[PDB]
């Protein structure tokens, strides 16, 4: 605040409080694999090179 | 009494066979012998693959 004359309407308000909410924005991305890929990844064979 | 082979014959392909199969979809068995005898100029192989 700032002081003023002997009778000017200086407001009594002091240290007001406010609330801020949160804005939501999820993101998404898919990735896909084939059955042959998963099979050859999982069951490692004793086969040749 | 007669002698017989005790176990199946284990035939495995060399890395050059693997890369040729991946690239051109074909294999020459005993590939290294082919390469060596071809480069050296020898016309014949001792045995088949």
Do the chains contact at B15 and A49, CB–CB below 8 Å? Answer: yes
| Nearest residue on chain B to A48, alpha-carbon basis | B12
Q: What is the dihedral of CA B22, B27, B28, B30, to 10 degrees?
A: 80
**Distance from C-alpha of B36 to C-alpha of B30, rounded to nearest angstrom:** 10
3-state helix, strand, coil in chain B (%, to 5): 40, 0, 60
Q: With contact defined as beta carbons under 8 Å apart, do B34 and B19 qualify?
A: no
**Contact predicate B16/B31, CB 8 Å:** yes
- Cβ contact A10:A1 at 8 Å: yes
């Amino acid at each position: 605040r700032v002081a003023s004359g002997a009778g000017l309407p200086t407001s009594r308000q002091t240290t007001i409080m406010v609330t801020k909410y949160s804005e939501k924005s999820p993101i998404t991305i898919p990735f896909e694999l084939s059955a042959a890929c998963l099979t050859y990844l999982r069951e490692t064979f004793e086969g040749t090179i | 009494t007669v002698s017989a082979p005790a176990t199946y014959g284990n035939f495995v392909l060399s890395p050059e066979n693997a890369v040729t199969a991946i690239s051109y979809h074909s294999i020459l068995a005993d590939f290294n012998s082919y390469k060596a005898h071809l480069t050296s100029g020898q016309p014949h192989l001792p045995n088949d693959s």
